[PDB]
A paper describes a structure:
Diphtheria toxin (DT) is secreted by Corynebacterium and causes disease in humans by inhibiting protein synthesis.
DT was crystallized under varying buffer conditions in an effort to determine if conformational changes, particularly in the T-domain, are observed with a decreasing pH. Overall, all of the structures are very similar, with RMSD deviations between the Cα atoms of 0.34 Å (997 residues, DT-5.5), 0.38 Å (999 residues, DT-6.0), and 0.41 Å (1000 residues, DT-7.0). One region that stands out is the TH2-TH3 region of the T-domain, which consistently displays large B-factors in each subunit of all structures. Interestingly, the residues between H223 to P234, which span TH2, appear to become more flexible at a lower pH. Analysis of the B-factors for each structure shows ordered TH2 residues in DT-7.0 and slightly higher B-factors in this region for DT-6.0 in each subunit (TH2-A and TH2-B). We demonstrate that neither catalytic nor receptor-binding domains change their structure upon this acidification, while the T-domain undergoes a conformational change that results in the unfolding of TH2–3 helices.
Author numbering:
A (entry chain A): 4 to 39, 48 to 187, 200 to 352, 354 to 516, 522 to 536
B (entry chain B): 5 to 38, 48 to 187, 200 to 351, 354 to 516, 522 to 537
């Protein structure tokens, strides 16, 4: 019951990876030893890029140096025992172990290695590494881990790069879409741009026109938006001017709101220390405006445009420190650039990692105040290759006032996929509402509720979509245009569009 | 597939059937039919049955018929099913995969194997998500045995609109919006008339271009009208209760009235069902209804009448500026909006989990957070050992931070397992540094920056350790929620996931 046989195997020269903190990259290669409770043991993973994320200075985890990644290998045969649950008690009861001795102590006995090892010399436990990941984590008994041989995958400190660039440049190989930026180039171009802009003519003439004394947030954002406009005319920011001109997330006013907000929270104690600056910056809103990240996309994905945005942000913080600050320099050009760069790398890394987009599987689709999601993963799958019925639950609510649900657009395929008009319905806080379904064309049925549906704070709906298949012939991608069910919200003549994405699969 | 805990035998088994206008008296002569689920449908909940009683040709606005109670004499087996897929049911319960399920249900061999001696079988299924009622599926021929008596005839109450049905449905709650819609209709007609002759308002209709204009100007005139109309003393209470919350501001009544006049043409204003279908798809109705932040604020007949009267006048004023017709404002507009009021009020009277409870999302400041599963939202007690709990987190557009999480602790009983507690961002696992704030609250910060946004989500895994098999008593626990902290504005955006303490089962 608790062992997943599909994830269990025996293997010769079983290898795994271990992230190593600075100062241990070379010592750990002399053998795994325990330092001077069911889960006490040596930890590793099958994904060396996830290993790399355990490698940062423990005293300065936000900003410190990354150590390395090493590869550990068991001689001979090793049993990888994948467990379906991470509760040790549940595991010891259901495997007939002694519920007293720790779980990882027993994993290392000869008696356990016989009952579960399949002839191998040792057992390693395997568990899901994390939600949203396909990696595994391996738990090794410490005594058994003395057999491991340890060699080097990478030493980030040996690369001799600034900040955490080496670690994140390594992690970006995972997707070698992919944001793979040369952060040496970006730093150098950033330094050059701040210098060449502080020594401009109208920028000089716009720093001349500055209150240069603690005024209210209002005059500050006004002057800062002015500065922004003036600074954006320089030819070293001309591409930035172009990619930030339409999307309102990238407007002067958000740069100004960013720079004001930075100056409010950065005092001298903080500005004096990189780790403290990064923590402070890392809890601010609006970092999307300077990163160029909006609508599910990293728009600023070239070294040149990123350097421009960071330089422009560097200037505006410099200008915002006297107007709404207790601080008295400099920070804008050094620790603020270091720190923001680190936050860039963090978010870029997130966007490079495989992830389900809004409205896919059980990820919510957030739009116009609505929140909609497939109730479970299986609901988002339209199974094919049988005659008969399926049902699919979509959750719907909204953030505050009552917003309508006008209906739902559903996919159909002549002969293979039909809306079951009798089982399809929508339920609002348990009130069950029937639907009037009408084909738009041969591929789309529109279903509208027979009484008004509203959702809002405290009011939710479950839309239950029922499909009927009149043939057992499978569906091929030729036949389906849409890959989404369109839930329609309020009308503005257009309807707000809430999309739930499905995949067609066999059993 | 049979849930034996919901299955029983009963003498004089009774249930309710919603009945559409025209058949209230006809149906009491006996249940007669006019594929796997062909059959007669009833429910254990007579207020849910009432929702089936509306004219099938004007389901939005039509007249409501009634509810009857049907009773089987002798013994009835209620067979509750764990699935509503007939194929799966016919396979697991060894039946002809050929014959319809509800035909087999009414055969003597079915009644032998499953009836427990009872004369006939009724199938029971969950009525709906978010509901605790059941639907009963009766074999048609077996249903001929039913005696049928009248629970209520909404048409006999002689009331306007769907008032009688919704007034019936409000009994389920005896917190309960139970409004007298007769009174609200009377007070509403009275105020529209009594505002139409006012001095300043008559003179604020004087200054109306009474000719098509730009929407941007239309809203300026109507916000003007709104301010002037709100000084009338028949609206004095409305002025007080709408003065602070920006959902209830004049600009929002103006947007409502403008959007109304845009979609009502002559064909539409002359037919109540078509008015209601058109009004029902507009945004902003919460401004008129006084509904915001999870609460029905306008919950008195007087204040609802005031709000509906004012909206009516403003619609009246917005049709010449932005519209195409005559009268609508005081006739079909009022009837239709009243029905939309009753729909939403009924939703708020029904039992429902609030945001952040069970798997209902908590939507705040652009974030969306929820418990992954119902069981995650329960902290079990009465044992020594561990539990884990998953919270989903994302945000609507740009990257927003997650600063940390506030967790409950109990000196000696409930502690944060700092090794297993972590947060994972698109699969990147991030350890946490946890530090007690007092004896009752721990604060865990992620050791790398966490951001969520469109396409970037997080799973917060909270693990709890109990060093005592003694149960937690409501006393020991101050909060009923886990506090996830977002961005700093000096305060953090507060995202609340509410839990319940329960013993093992």
């Amino acid at each position: 019951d608790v062992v997943d046989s599909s994830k269990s195997f025996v293997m010769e020269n079983f290898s795994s990876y271990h992230g190593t903190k600075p100062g241990y990259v070379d010592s750990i290669q002399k053998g795994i030893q325990k330092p001077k409770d069911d889960w006490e043991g040596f930890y590793s993973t099958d994904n060396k890029y996830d290993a790399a994320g355990y490698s940062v200075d423990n005293e300065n985890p936000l900003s410190g140096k990354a150590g390395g990644v090493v590869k550990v290998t068991y001689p001979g045969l090793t049993k990888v025992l994948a467990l379906k649950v991470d509760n040790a008690e549940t595991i010891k009861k259901e495997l007939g172990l002694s519920l007293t001795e720790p779980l990882m102590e027993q994993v290392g006995t000869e008696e356990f290695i016989k009952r579960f090892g399949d002839g191998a010399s040792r057992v390693v436990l395997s568990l899901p590494f994390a939600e949203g990941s396909s990696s595994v984590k391996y738990i090794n008994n410490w005594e058994q881990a003395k057999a491991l041989s340890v060699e080097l995958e990478i030493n980030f400190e040996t690369r001799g790069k600034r900040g955490q660039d080496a670690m994140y440049e390594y992690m970006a190989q995972a997707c070698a879409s992919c944001i793979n930026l040369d952060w040496d180039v970006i730093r150098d171009k950033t330094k050059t741009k701040i210098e060449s802009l502080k020594e401009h003519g109208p920028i000089k003439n716009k720093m001349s026109e500055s209150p240069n004394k603690t005024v209210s947030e209002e005059k500050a954002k006004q002057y800062l938006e002015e500065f922004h406009q003036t600074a954006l005319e320089h030819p070293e920011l001309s591409e930035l001017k172009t990619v930030t001109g339409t999307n309102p997330v990238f407007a002067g006013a958000n740069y100004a709101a960013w720079a004001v907000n930075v100056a409010q929270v950065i005092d001298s104690e903080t500005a004096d220390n990189l780790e403290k600056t990064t923590a402070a910056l890392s809890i601010l809103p609006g970092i999307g405006s300077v990163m160029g990240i909006a609508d599910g996309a990293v728009h600023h994905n070239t070294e040149e445009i990123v350097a421009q945005s960071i330089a422009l942000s560097s200037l505006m913080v410099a200008q915002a420190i006297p107007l709404v600050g207790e601080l008295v320099d400099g920070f804008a050009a050094y620790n603020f650039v270091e720190s923001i760069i680190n936050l860039f790398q963090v978010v870029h890394n997130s966007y490079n990692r495989p992830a389900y987009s809004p409205g896919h599987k059980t990820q919510p689709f957030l739009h116009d105040g609505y929140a909609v999601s497939w109730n479970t993963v299986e609901d988002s799958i339209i199974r094919t290759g049988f005659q008969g019925e399926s049902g699919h639950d979509i959750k719907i609510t909204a953030e505050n006032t009552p917003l309508p649900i006008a209906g739902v657009l559903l996919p159909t395929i002549p002969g293979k996929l039909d809306v079951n008009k009798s089982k399809t319905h929508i339920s609002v806080n348990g009130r069950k509402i029937r639907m009037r379904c009408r084909a738009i064309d041969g591929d789309v049925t529109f279903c509208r509720p027979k009484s008004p549906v509203y959702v809002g704070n405290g009011v939710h709906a479950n839309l239950h979509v029922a499909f009927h298949r009149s043939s057992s012939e499978k569906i091929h991608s030729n036949e389906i245009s849409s890959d989404s069910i369109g839930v329609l919200g309020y009308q503005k003549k257009v309807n707000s569009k809430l999309s739930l994405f499905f995949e067609i699969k066999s059993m």
